[PDB]
Amino acid sequence: GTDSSQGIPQLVSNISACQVIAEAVRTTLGPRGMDKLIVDGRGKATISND
Amino acid sequence: KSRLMGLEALKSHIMAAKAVANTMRTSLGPNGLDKMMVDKDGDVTVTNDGATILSMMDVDHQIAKLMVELSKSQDDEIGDGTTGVVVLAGALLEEAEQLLDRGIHPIRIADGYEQAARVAIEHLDKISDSVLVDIKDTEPLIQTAKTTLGSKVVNSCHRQMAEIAVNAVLTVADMERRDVDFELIKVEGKVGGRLEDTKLIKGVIVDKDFSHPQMPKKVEDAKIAILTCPFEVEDYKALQKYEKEKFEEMIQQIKETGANLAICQWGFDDEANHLLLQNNLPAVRWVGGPEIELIAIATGGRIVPRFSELTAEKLGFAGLVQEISFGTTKDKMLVIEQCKNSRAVTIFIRGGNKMIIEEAKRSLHDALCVIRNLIRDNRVVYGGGAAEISCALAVSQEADKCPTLEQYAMRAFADALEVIPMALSENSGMNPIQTMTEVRARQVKEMNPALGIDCLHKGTNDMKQQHVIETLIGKKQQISLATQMVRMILKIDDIRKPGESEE
Amino acid sequence: DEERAETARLTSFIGAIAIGDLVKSTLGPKGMDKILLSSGRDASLMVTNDGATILKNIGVDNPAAKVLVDMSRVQDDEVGDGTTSVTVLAAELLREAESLIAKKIHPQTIIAGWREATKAAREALLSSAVDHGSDEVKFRQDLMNIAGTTLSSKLLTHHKDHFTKLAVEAVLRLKGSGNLEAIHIIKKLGGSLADSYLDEGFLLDKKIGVNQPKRIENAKILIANTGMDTKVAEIEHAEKEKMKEKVERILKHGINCFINRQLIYNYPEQLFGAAGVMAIEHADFAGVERLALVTGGEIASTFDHPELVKLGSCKLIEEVMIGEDKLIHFSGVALGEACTIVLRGATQQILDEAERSLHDALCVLAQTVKDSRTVYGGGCSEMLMAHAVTQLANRTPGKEAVAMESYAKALRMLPTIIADNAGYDSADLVAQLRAAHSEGNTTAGLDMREGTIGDMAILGITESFQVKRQVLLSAAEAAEVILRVDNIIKAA
Amino acid sequence: ARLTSFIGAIAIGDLVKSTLGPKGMDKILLSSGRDASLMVTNDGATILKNIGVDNPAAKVLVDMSRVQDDEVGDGTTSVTVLAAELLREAESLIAKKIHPQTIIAGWREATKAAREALLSSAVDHGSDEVKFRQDLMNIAGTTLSSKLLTHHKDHFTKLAVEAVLRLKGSGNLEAIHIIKKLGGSLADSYLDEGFLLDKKIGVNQPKRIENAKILIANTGKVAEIEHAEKEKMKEKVERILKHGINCFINRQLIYNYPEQLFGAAGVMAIEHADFAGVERLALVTGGEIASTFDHPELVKLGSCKLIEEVMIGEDKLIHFSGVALGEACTIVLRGATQQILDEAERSLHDALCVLAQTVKDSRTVYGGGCSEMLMAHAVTQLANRTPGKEAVAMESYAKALRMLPTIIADNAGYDSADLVAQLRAAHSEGNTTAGLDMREGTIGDMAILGITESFQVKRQVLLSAAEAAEVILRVDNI
Amino acid sequence: PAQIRFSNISAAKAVADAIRTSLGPKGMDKMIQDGKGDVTITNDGATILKQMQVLHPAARMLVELSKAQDIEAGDGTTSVVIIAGSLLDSCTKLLQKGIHPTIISESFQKALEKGIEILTDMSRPVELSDRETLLNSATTSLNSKVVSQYSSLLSPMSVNAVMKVIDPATATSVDLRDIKIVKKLGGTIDDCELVEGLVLTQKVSNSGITRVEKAKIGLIQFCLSAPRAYILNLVKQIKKTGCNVLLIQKSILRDALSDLALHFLNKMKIMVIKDIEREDIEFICKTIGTKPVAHIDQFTADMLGSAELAEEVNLNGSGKLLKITGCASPGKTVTIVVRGSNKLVIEEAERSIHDALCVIRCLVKKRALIAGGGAPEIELALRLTEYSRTLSGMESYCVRAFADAMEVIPSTLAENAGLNPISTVTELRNRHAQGEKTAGINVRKGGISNILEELVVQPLLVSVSALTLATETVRSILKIDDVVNTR
């Protein structure tokens, strides 16, 4: 339970939101980057490094 | 709340994936505990081959879905011993987790396993004491097919069954291109019968009905049709004029064309066929679709369902003159064997058990890979774990003259290969540790690499006299397509699952 | 539907042991009847001492127990009676095996012990399967012994005399090679089990009425297609014209009897009687098969190609009325093998029970006409198997010496439960029988009509070898089949 | 309440099960949290002694092991394991609805056959036949199992082989004697002739004395009668100078005015030794025990000839030599820990007790569990003969006799399901001389390898185990 | 095994004790509003058992016993339940003592045959047909009702109907097959007649001639329908042959004989009666000899049934009934033409005539008679106790267990008549052990005396059949040891 909609909480929520989406693509940088596997939900397995 | 990520992701998938391996590691070896298969519908059967086990099972975690996806891409490669790829998957993943305990990055573990595989396959070529002259090897092919049948009493009819196998690989032996194609499907399994009635017929006996149910079946002539002709009182009088028309135009177009045993796939009235019977020529109503190639290869022709294209050189074709009661209590089936040889060849199985049907199709296909690997690349390795111990010793030896941290992968690699003689010895009801390390000591004191694990409970651990024989393509494909997927699992960290609403 | 290692083999063993316990009490000639509810709305509270209908009626969803039920079906279609004992022996072997896994013995060693133990029991059966003189020097009472022991928990104790007389005329006349196609069983209602006697045909009368003569001699007899007769009305009318053209094609034979299978309304029957044709509609098709070989008339769809003499030919066929019921005796068949038996009793389950039990009795009698060797029943053969397997376990070294001994216990638990369902003492007498069988050699066994040890060759409780070898082999194979199989998608 | 009796006895038999055989693994005798710190022990006999047993039925098994304890020494663990295994066998027969009295009768008539089948293989050794040595050294070594003292094990067998010439009257276990100090090892024991107490007058008291007639002393207007009691104890020290003695046991405490006045009169007063050594002082030297010593005036004293007291190598290494019955062959090691104090004494008592059983009756049977397999096969053959429900009660009596060489193979680290069963199958035709070797872990000729065991402990195990079984099986309530 | 057998014992004992107070004529009425509103005010336990919501197997087998005892003898319906429930209650002592249920069941079989052979010669049998003692049993049965004033109206009519045809069925015993019964609403109670042959009650109203001496009879079940082809051909066949009295059935459709064919069948004025009763159709055909044929092309010349006098005659002044004599084999079920203006004098007359039938078939299947009302149960409880004293083995108590379970029938008869049950039962035992068999409890006056003077007597086969059925079901429920649902 954490409420964050005032101005400094606004920017803090925004930069935590950019940090998590950066972690979602963090390992894929470089030619030998780590693969991430996602699906569509129905069984369409997609392994990507892009 | 909770969010599983990072290296703890890699910990969670491995204990997932090796759990699947923990299901399959009790199925390794011919003395492995073979295993049921129960559908969601409610059907029940038994299978020993692990590929059917993994394919017809339904898994929940996506790593196991990846595993069965890639191991089904190994079934076309080998099809035999696809269990061992999953066993080595779990083994290398366990040892990779053991290296991850010491802090090594899994990319380094992955390409260290790759370097250890580059030790492994080449040392397998070094210990390759294969016999390459296995072309006219009809006498050792009994021993080749013997270990494939070794789990059952099929060895007691291997004087029939293994000789069926050697005649089968003799007949398919395209001596330059060396392959079973989609046409050369070698199965006619009569559900119901006995051990010897699985026997030598290179022909077509399908469950279709007769021309006439009391017709003299002796159609020696290769003048035989296959029709694409369907059924497509002034209504019935016009249709009966179309019926005697269809006689005097389809059958007279046949008399112009030569398509005589009119095996129609659709509706017809047999009194026209009965008047053909008074003129002494047969014609069957309501026959099956895709068997035109199997019928038509029986002298060398191909699929000819056409009205006009079925000519005197591309007839419905017939194999070899024999007249046995096909249906003893069943309706007696089609004698499509009269004339010449079948290249897209197919054998008579009368196996009453679904197990002996399943093994005599797929172990015959595994022969059709490994006796293909007596022509495509005639390189055999003495199996029964001896290949794995001989390989693991040299992997540990090559883990000495290398200066990197990658060394700890190779020592993690070789011990993982030790799960293969362990599960051979565990499923055979012996001490899994002591038997394998005693065979390893016997190998480090005696340089024969054909000392393995006595799975058959015969005399000694020497695989020469018992002929537990795999091929080098079947070993190399196994190790390489275990490494190529251990690297695949180790390169995947974050399964951000879609629709699983990340709060 | 995934599982785990400790759970799956455990619940498989529990399901198979539960099936063997649900055929435990209905074993031997002292059966405690179980009640088969099918809850529904008004499921009959049916009692039965036969266990084959129980396993037929058990709705089981544990698939290892479904494999056990299926192996009981294989034994049911193989021999008939004994599937209760087969399932009991298989569940007993599994109860033995899970105690060995409790001692941490690998299952493959258990199967390796059970295989050679089964081979030793199979040769120990031949060690005492002596061929009685019931077919050699033609004893009749020993046919009554073998057709009394498999006739336990049944209704025909009056005309077990008649069934054994059919066995005498089977070894004399009705052997095709021991013909299992002559097994022809009919009955109606009114009376009791003392009304079984001889016939040679099925029960359908002249459907013209009593106006059709009885002795319709020379039956050229098969199956027809449609009933005969004289713009939809006009299209069926021209079909009626073609069908009258067809009765003009069948009248030139001179037939007496005929089997027109389809339901015959008025003027088809009228033109049957005008042409002297019989119309018999959908009997027991095995009896029509006996009309197809013992009489001659095969099944047929149309009749356009058989036209003059291309039928089944017989000598004599009649349709009579005896005892104010549709009792029809097809006297005068070409080959006098399918001697039908007619009874007139009380209940309707005997319509299947007498047929299946005469199939069972004639199946084990056919086992005797292939090979009349037989052992002494009452669990004496089971004691012999347990003693032989016990001595072979005393000789054999290795871990497998454990796996044989429990196997011998699985044999020794077989006559105990039949004693346990006898009401008489079980443990003391089976122990005394075992201690006697160890030195006071194999002619001694258990009698439950008096509940004692006694010479079974004197008391004449026989059992055919070909059913006992089948029982031991099928039970051991089913137990090993489920023993090889541990942790899969195996159960829910 | 019959099930919980079996449970309480099975727990006690389990708490000596992993200590069975000389590959046994030690348990922890942790206790009351004051000073409980640690106790490791391979000896299962002292395990049950330090068990605070709760169930009173298990107390019966404990005291049956106590009856086994003072009889021969080691053998409590085998009796307890065999009895708990018999009870685990019997509770399986009870659940099959057999009356306990039939099981008791089956135990009895099975134990009779198992007793006589030991006598069928009663092999006698050549130490009491042809005066051999090593054959009795084997049983003297395997009674020293789960111990350390193998260097001067030959000294233990020396005290054994000198017993049959010197320390047996009827196999006397009173002429044996063990003491030790700390600092050193297995290589310190030697032949001594008594206890370790010294001359006490000091630098003036000489070593060799002439003749030690030896017994017990007493002790050493209110103040004047206190001086009168001093005069009476001074009358005593005048009455002891006219004796002529040279040693005396001083069982009650004494300060310097009695003490120096004793030794100036030539009286060496030995201050309150443990009474077990004073037993050897009573007859093996020959000086009895009293409380008063007024009435021995010249005749009613002790009788000995020579007692000497030397001081060798950091001990009070007194060699009480020259006694009138020169039989008190005393072992003085200088061991490592405090545990060897009771261990060497009790292990020599256990060894030389069954060695005295051999100098009574030197028959032996091969150890390593093959005698257990022979009794098992013997009761199994009788199980195949008699009818009735009691034929079942013999079979389980076989099974505990299978479990006794199993557990010995089990605590050896080796597999035990195979070669115990292989030994059971091989014993039926490849007759009695075969057996289980625990050290190399195989099947071998036990008569060739010489792993034997005294008959007078095997009969005492096999009888008393069934005796403990029949008592607690017949009890059902409370 | 035992935990389900005990539940069977408890359920059958509880369902037997739910009607145990209703034994005897002083058995009080019940009221169970189980289900959805059952006002079950009745003193007879058979209809109580037929409305009992029963889910247990062993509780349902006694409901099967009720109908079995009603089929065999028609009387003693609650007795076969009370004896069985007391026996199954007494099996619990034999189960807890240690006897296996097989020995219990076979010892009950031995006690059953011993009790049957003890009861069968301690009777006072009849020697001939003995119509005086048939009327005596009628005074025991047909009276104590509202047909007590119709007792001489009804008893010698059925006695003479059995005198006419002492019919050879189950060793020349009374079947349900003497001379065919009918019943007509209205009339007086004295308007019953004893007929010879077939009677019809339904309303045939023909103005013309239905009175033919050679009344040819057919059964054409083909009525008329609605699309002329399959309509008039049966009437043309009637004009061919001349079947002047034909019973009509509406098995095809509803417009049975429309005016096209009805005037065709009233140009000779055939007997016309529709919607004929299905169970009595085959009895009508057994009477007549015609064939029950609906296919109009299957009407042959040998389907011509025989009849001598066929009239739509106003029997007893106004009842337009169709009586028929002179048939092939008439006589289908014992004639009492139940006429009554009131409804209760219809239903009670027919029910008491069926009671008279089920007792005279009891009187001549077994031709003995005992003093009913607790006397043979006390006799069995004495003689079987002596026999169980003579008997050895584990059966020696079970027959004794068979004996004490016999004692519930006098005690309930002692309890429902208001007497102190246990003392009157053992006083009856003391009187019987030194006196006679016929001593018992006269419930009709409420006192223990010699019943053969006080005349509460019953035929033997009621008691024999009740003991046989109760021992059979007790035997079966003891042998029942397993149940399984989910087929």
Both E340 and E394 in one domain: the answer is no
Q: Which two tokens stand for residue E304?
A: 């011509």
What CATH number does residue B65 fall under? 1.10.560.10
Burial of A22 (0-12, 13-18, 19+ CB in 10 A): exposed
Both E438 and E485 in one domain: the answer is yes
Chain A residue with the nearest C-alpha to that of B497: A38
* Contact with chain C for residue E292, Cβ under 8 A: no
H-helix or E-strand containing D95?
none
Both E392 and E480 in one domain: the answer is yes
Chain C meets chain A (3+ C-beta pairs below 8 A): no
Chain C residue with the nearest C-alpha to that of B45: C67
Other Cβ atoms less than 10 A from the Cβ of D202: the count is 9
Instruction: Determine the Cα–Cα distance for residues B321 and B339; give it in Å rounded to an integer.
Output: 7
Both B401 and B468 in one domain: the answer is yes
Both E206 and E276 in one domain: the answer is yes
The minimal CB distance from E482 to the residues C25, C59, C267 is found for: C25
Direct distance between the N- and C-terminal alpha carbons of chain D, in angstroms, rounded to an integer = 6
E36 appears as a binding residue in the annotation: no
- Residue B438 identity (one-letter amino acid): E
Q: Is E355 considered catalytic here?
A: yes
What CATH number does residue E328 fall under? 3.50.7.10
The structural domain count of chain E equals 3
* CA distances in angstroms from C331 to C195, C200, D237, listed in the order given: 19, 6, 139
Identify whether the C-beta of residue C311 lies closer than 8 Å to the C-beta of residue C220: yes
Both B233 and B332 in one domain: the answer is yes
D75 appears as a binding residue in the annotation: yes
Indicate which of A37, A44, A48 best probes the interface with B, i.e. most B CBs within 10 Å of its own CB: A37
Residue B4 is classified by DSSP as: -
Indicate which of C391, C399, C453 best probes the interface with D, i.e. most D CBs within 10 Å of its own CB: C399
Strands (E), D187-339: 191-192, 248-250, 269-271, 329-335
Both E251 and E157 in one domain: the answer is no
Both E7 and E115 in one domain: the answer is yes
Both B319 and B243 in one domain: the answer is yes
Chain D residue with the nearest C-alpha to that of C393: D425
Both B219 and B190 in one domain: the answer is no
Residue A2 is classified by DSSP as: -
Q: Is B462 considered catalytic here?
A: no
Catalytic residues of C: 50, 83-84, 360
> What are chain C's domains?
1-131+372-492 (1.10.560.10), 132-206+329-371 (3.30.260.10), 207-328 (3.50.7.10)
Determine whether the interchain pair C33/E101 forms a contact, defined as Cβ–Cβ distance below 8 Å: no
Identify whether the C-beta of residue D76 lies closer than 8 Å to the C-beta of residue D63: no
* Contact with chain C for residue B59, Cβ under 8 A: yes
Both B173 and B246 in one domain: the answer is no
Domain boundary among E310, E332, E354: E332
Both B169 and B214 in one domain: the answer is no
Instruction: Determine the Cα–Cα distance for residues E403 and E387; give it in Å rounded to an integer.
Output: 10
Identify whether the C-beta of residue C249 lies closer than 8 Å to the C-beta of residue C302: no
Name every residue whose Cβ is closer than 8 Å to that of residue D149 and which is 6 or more positions away in sequence: D156, D186, D189, D333, D340, D343, D344, D347
H-helix or E-strand containing C338?
none
D368 appears as a binding residue in the annotation: yes
Instruction: Determine the Cα–Cα distance for residues B247 and E204; give it in Å rounded to an integer.
Output: 67
Return the CA Rg of chain D.
Answer: 27
Both E273 and E258 in one domain: the answer is yes
Domain holding B318, by residue range, is 203-342
Instruction: Determine the Cα–Cα distance for residues E229 and C93; give it in Å rounded to an integer.
Output: 74
Q: Which two tokens stand for residue C391?
A: 């001595």
Resolution reached, in Å?
A: 4.0
Return the CA Rg of chain E.
Answer: 27
* Contact with chain B for residue C235, Cβ under 8 A: yes
Determine whether the interchain pair B492/A39 forms a contact, defined as Cβ–Cβ distance below 8 Å: no
Q: Which of chain C's residues have a Cβ under 8 Å away from the Cβ of E100?
A: 423-424
Determine whether the interchain pair E480/C33 forms a contact, defined as Cβ–Cβ distance below 8 Å: yes
Instruction: Determine the Cα–Cα distance for residues D408 and E304; give it in Å rounded to an integer.
Output: 102
Both B453 and B374 in one domain: the answer is no
Question: Among candidates B494, C191, C481, E467, which has minimal Cα distance to A24?
Answer: B494
From the CA of D360, how many Å to the nearest CA of chain C? 38
Both E20 and E121 in one domain: the answer is yes
Domain boundary among B378, B403, B426: B378
* Contact with chain C for residue B46, Cβ under 8 A: yes
Both B238 and B189 in one domain: the answer is no
Both B72 and B153 in one domain: the answer is no
Q: Which of chain A's residues have a Cβ under 8 Å away from the Cβ of B494?
A: 24, 27, 36-37
- Residue C140 identity (one-letter amino acid): R
**DSSP-derived secondary structure for C74-125:** HHHHHTSTTHHHHHHHHHHHHHHHHHHHHTT--HHHHHHHHHHHHHHHHHHH
The minimal CB distance from B491 to the residues A23, A35, A39 is found for: A35
Q: Which chains touch B (3 or more CB pairs under 8 A)?
A: A, C
- Residue C322 identity (one-letter amino acid): I
- Residues paired with D179 in a beta bridge: D332
Q: Which of chain A's residues have a Cβ under 8 Å away from the Cβ of B493?
A: 27, 34-36
Instruction: Determine the Cα–Cα distance for residues B182 and B187; give it in Å rounded to an integer.
Output: 12
Both B126 and B138 in one domain: the answer is no
Both E176 and E76 in one domain: the answer is no
Chain C residue with the nearest C-alpha to that of D423: C397
Both B470 and B411 in one domain: the answer is yes
Determine whether the interchain pair E57/C37 forms a contact, defined as Cβ–Cβ distance below 8 Å: yes
From the CA of E442, how many Å to the nearest CA of chain C? 40
Q: Is B49 considered catalytic here?
A: yes
Instruction: Determine the Cα–Cα distance for residues D340 and D331; give it in Å rounded to an integer.
Output: 12
From the CA of B204, how many Å to the nearest CA of chain C? 28
The structural domain count of chain B equals 3
Both B321 and B441 in one domain: the answer is no
Name every residue whose Cβ is closer than 8 Å to that of residue E118 and which is 6 or more positions away in sequence: E379, E380, E383, E384
Residue B255 is classified by DSSP as: H
Domain holding E187, by residue range, is 127-193+333-367
From the CA of E482, how many Å to the nearest CA of chain C? 5
> Of B23, B47, B83, B257, which one is the catalytic site residue?
B83
* CA distances in angstroms from B503 to B2, B3, B5, B494, listed in the order given: 9, 9, 14, 16
Domain boundary among B316, B342, B368: B342
Domain boundary among B319, B342, B365: B342
Q: Which of chain D's residues have a Cβ under 8 Å away from the Cβ of C395?
A: 425, 428-429
Convert chain E into a string of H (helix), E (strand) and C (coil).
CHHHHHHHHHHHHHHHHCCHHHCCCCCCCCCCCCCCCCCCCCCCHHHHHCCCCCCCHHHHHHHHHHHHHHHHCCCCCCHHHHHHHHHHHHHHHHHHHCCCHHHHHHHHHHHHHHHHHHHCCCCCCCCCCCHHHHHHHHHHHCCCCCCCCCHHHHHHHHHHHHHHCCCCECCCECCCCCCECCEEEECCHHHCCCCCCCEECCCCCCCCCCCCCCCCEEEECCCCCCCCCCCCHHHHHHHHHCCCEECCCCCCCCCCCCHHHHHHCCCCCCECCCCCCHHHHHHHHHHHCCCEECCHHHCCHHHCECCCCEEEEEECCCEEEEEECCCCCCCCCECCCEEECCCHHHHHHHHHHHHHHHHHHHHHHCCCEECCCCHHHHHHHHHHHHHHHHCCCCHHHHHHHHHHHHHHHHHHHHHHCCCCHHHHHHHHHHHHHHCCCCEEEECCCCEEEEHHHHCCCEEHHHHHHHHHHHHHHHHHHHHCCEEECCC
Q: Is B82 considered catalytic here?
A: yes
Instruction: Determine the Cα–Cα distance for residues E236 and E259; give it in Å rounded to an integer.
Output: 15
Half-sphere exposure of E370 (CA within 13 A, CB side): 27
From the CA of C136, how many Å to the nearest CA of chain B? 32
Identify whether the C-beta of residue E414 lies closer than 8 Å to the C-beta of residue E424: yes
Question: Among candidates C70, C58, C11, C2, which has minimal Cα distance to B40?
Answer: C2
C357 appears as a binding residue in the annotation: no
* Contact with chain C for residue D442, Cβ under 8 A: no
Other Cβ atoms less than 10 A from the Cβ of E241: the count is 14
